[PDB]
Amino acid sequence: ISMKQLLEAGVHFGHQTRRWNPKMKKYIFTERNGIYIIDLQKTVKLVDAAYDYMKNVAEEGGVALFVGTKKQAQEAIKDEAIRAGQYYVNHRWLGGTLTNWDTIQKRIARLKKINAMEEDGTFEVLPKKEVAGLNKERERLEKFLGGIADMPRIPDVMYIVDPRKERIAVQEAHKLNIPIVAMVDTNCDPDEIDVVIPSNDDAIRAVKLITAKMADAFIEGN
RNA sequence: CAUGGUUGUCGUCAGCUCGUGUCGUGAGAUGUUGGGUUAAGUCCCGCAACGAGCGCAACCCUUAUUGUUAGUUGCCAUCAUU
Numbered sequence: 001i002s003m004k005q006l007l008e009a010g011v012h013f014g015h016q017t018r019r020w021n022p023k024m025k026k027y028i029f030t031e032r033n034g035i036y037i038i039d040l041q042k043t044v045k046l047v048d049a050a051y052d053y054m055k056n057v058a059e060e061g062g063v064a065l066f067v068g069t070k071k072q073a074q075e076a077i078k079d080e081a082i083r084a085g086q087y088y089v090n091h092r093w094l095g096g097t098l099t100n101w102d103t104i105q106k107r108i109a110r111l112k113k114i115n116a117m118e119e120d121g122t123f124e125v126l127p128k129k130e131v132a133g134l135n136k137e138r139e140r141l142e143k144f145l146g147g148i149a150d151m152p153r154i155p156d157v158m159y160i161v162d163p164r165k166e167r168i169a170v171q172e173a174h175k176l177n178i179p180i181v182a183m184v185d186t187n188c189d190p191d192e193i194d195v196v197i198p199s200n201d202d203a204i205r206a207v208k209l210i211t212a213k214m215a216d217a218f219i220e221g222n
Numbered sequence: 223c224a225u226g227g228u229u230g231u232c233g234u235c236a237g238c239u240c241g242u243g244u245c246g247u248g249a250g251a252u253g254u255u256g257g258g259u260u261a262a263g264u265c266c267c268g269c270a271a272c273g274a275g276c277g278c279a280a281c282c283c284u285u286a287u288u289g290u291u292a293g294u295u296g297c298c299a300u301c302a303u304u
């Protein structure tokens with residue numbers, strides 16, 4: 001990845017100066033027009049390190065979970081996770097998604113069952129109300145758990161966009177001692193993330209750029 | 223005022239709870255709250271909650287329309303007689 005690519009994607013932008021986090025001074029370059037500017041030099045070095053780290057995880061046969069519910073990041077992470085073959089959560093991170101993974105597997109099994117009914121033809125012989133109601137249930141299960149329906153075990157690594165937004169996901173990862181690779185913004189906390197990627201979380205182009213790099217790292221590892 | 227069984231009562235009011243998860247040193251909390259909606263914890267939406275159970279509802283009986291099968295001890299329009 002290139003510094004010009006980062007700048008074009010707008011990675012450098014941060015949030016308001018008043019809303020920053022002191023720990024981010026380690027990565028902040030300068031403030032312009034009242035908003036902080038991430039140090040793209042450290043960003044390039046750290047994204048390369050994260051690329052290498054994700055590559056190692058992939059080569060180990062590990063499972064990756066891409067997390068982002070930001071309006072900007074939701075669609076981008078879905079596409080890249082699908083492309084990489086690893087699983088994703090993009091609409092809403094359900095509390096206990098991993099700490100209560102055992103419970104969530106029951107809903108995933110329920111989702112698998114409702115899919116089989118369509119293929120089998122139960123829906124055809126199902127009463128109007130039944131099929132309609134079951135279709136609505138299937139829609140909710142897909143909308144929430146769709147991106148992780150086939151995740152075999154607890155992810156070996158969790159990539160996150162804007163942990164400050166994805167507070168709950170970070171907490172579950174810590175509880176399960178799962179490494180976190182996050183797009184950290186000027187108002188976030190870097191201590192919570194093992195592999196920090198100082199970047200703007202509020203730029204769709206930047207999110208696509210960084211997320212695609214991570215997905216390519218996993219693909220290369222495989 | 224040792225009990226089983228049976229019953230009244232709030233009240234057919236919409237509540238009462240648990241599993242896992244999470245928060246809290248702890249009793250506890252969350253879900254069950256909140257925006258709507260309903261007769262209803264009824265349902266949708268959002269939510270560190272995700273589900274489930276007892277309730278609610280539905281399945282049951284009766285009443286209100288009707289087809290078909292049946293046509294006597296019931297009914298009498300078409301017919302004649304009493």
Ligand SMILES: [K+]
Nearest residue numbers: 241242243252
């Ligand atoms: K509990």
Ligand SMILES: [Mg+2]
Nearest residue numbers: 263264277278
């Ligand atoms: Mg109920």
